[PDB]
Amino acid sequence: ANDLLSKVKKDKSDSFGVTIGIGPAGSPLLVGVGVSHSQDTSFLNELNKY
Amino acid sequence: AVLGGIYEYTLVMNKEAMERGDYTLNNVHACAKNDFKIGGAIEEVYVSL
């Protein structure tokens, strides 16, 4: 009798966002920038042999 | 000569058994997030990063 079981799983994520707003003038001014990111990764693999 | 009979009998038996089992598991997880924001205002300029 022979038995073999192999299962691998890998999960990776990433999230980054840069928000920069600058406005220079004699009169009142406003500058707004919004950036957001998100990454999700899921991997699963299973093997069974008997 | 000697008259009679010969009765012979034998039983030879053996047994062998072997079992082995291996199991391993390793899980590693990492998370890192760093955030920073700056802002400045003085007459008559405005800086926000």
Q: What is the resolution of this structure in A?
A: 5.6
CB contact under 8 A, B49 and A11: no
Token pair, residue A35, equals 């950036």
Say whether the peptide bond before residue B8 is cis (omega within 30 degrees of 0): no
Closest by Cα among A12, A4, A10, A15 to A45: A10
CA A25 from centroid of its chain's CA atoms: 37
User: Tokens 């999960």, residue?
Assistant: A11
Cα angle at B19 between B14 and B22, to 5 degrees?
A: 170
SS percent in chain A: helix, strand, coil, step 5: 0, 45, 55
Interchain CB contact of A4 with B (< 8 Å): no
Q: B31 contacts in A (CB within 8 Å)? A: 13
Method of structure determination: cryo-EM
Burial class (CB in 10 A: 0-12, 13-18, 19+), B48: middle
Judge whether B37 is closer than 8 Å to chain A, CB to CB. yes
Give B43's DSSP letter: T
Helices (H), A1-50: none
Q: Identify all chain B residues contacting A33, using CB atoms and an 8 Å cutoff.
A: none
Under 8 Å between Cβ of A48 and A5: yes
